[PDB]
Ligand binder design. Sequence first.
Ligand SMILES: CC(=O)N[C@@H]1[C@@H](O)[C@H](O[C@@H]2O[C@H](CO)[C@H](O)[C@H](O[C@]3(C(=O)O)C[C@H](O)[C@@H](NC(C)=O)[C@H]([C@H](O)[C@H](O)CO)O3)[C@H]2O)[C@@H](CO)O[C@H]1O
Ligand code: CL
Length: 147
Amino acid sequence: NLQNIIYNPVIPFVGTIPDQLDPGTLIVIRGHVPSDADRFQVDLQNGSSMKPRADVAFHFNPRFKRAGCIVCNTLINEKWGREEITYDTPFKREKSFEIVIMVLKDKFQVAVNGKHTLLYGHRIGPEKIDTLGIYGKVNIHSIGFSF
Ligand SMILES: CC(=O)N[C@@H]1[C@@H](O)[C@H](O[C@@H]2O[C@H](CO)[C@H](O)[C@H](O[C@]3(C(=O)O)C[C@H](O)[C@@H](NC(C)=O)[C@H]([C@H](O)[C@H](O)CO)O3)[C@H]2O)[C@@H](CO)O[C@H]1O
Ligand SMILES: [Cl-]
C-alpha cells in the first residue's frame, strides 16, 4: 500500500526513496500552492549531490506566471534537455492538490486531483532514481510511495 516517508516537510525537501521505482510504483504528493507562488518543482533524482548537481531524471515544474503551465525536463551532467511544456495545468495559487505519479515501463504518467495531466517518457533509466526533491514556493502535506 502507501508508505509515506514524511509529513509537512520543510521546503526545500530532499529525501531518499526507500525502494526502486519499478513499473507499477506510485508516488503520491499532497500539498498546497501559496498565493505568492511563482513556481515549484518535484525532481526525481539520481543521488542528492549539489555540486556537481545530481542528475534529474524527471523534473516536474509547475509555473504560475501568466496563464501558467508545467515544464518537464531532464538534467544530465548539469545540462537541461528539451523541455516538454504542458499548457493545460490544474495548479493554482491558494489551492490544494494531490499529485499521483505512476512509474510505467517507458514513461511517467501524472494525474492531479484525480485528473490525468501529462506523460513524460523516460530519458534516464528510472532504476537510477533514488532521491526525491521538492523545491520552490509550495507547501507539502505529505510524500508517500506505493511499491
Ligand atoms: C527556452 C525557454 O523556454 N526558456 C528557458 C527556461 O525555461 C530555462 O529555465 C530553466 O528551465 C529548467 C527546465 O528546463 C528548470 O526549470 C530551471 O529551474 C531551475 C533549475 O532547477 O535548474 C530552478 C533553480 O532554483 C534555479 N537555481 C537558482 C540559482 O535559483 C535554476 C537556475 O536558475 C538555472 O539552472 C540557471 O540556468 O533553474 C529553469 O531555470 C532557462 C534556463 O535553463 O533557459 C531558457 O532558455
Ligand atoms: Cl510504458
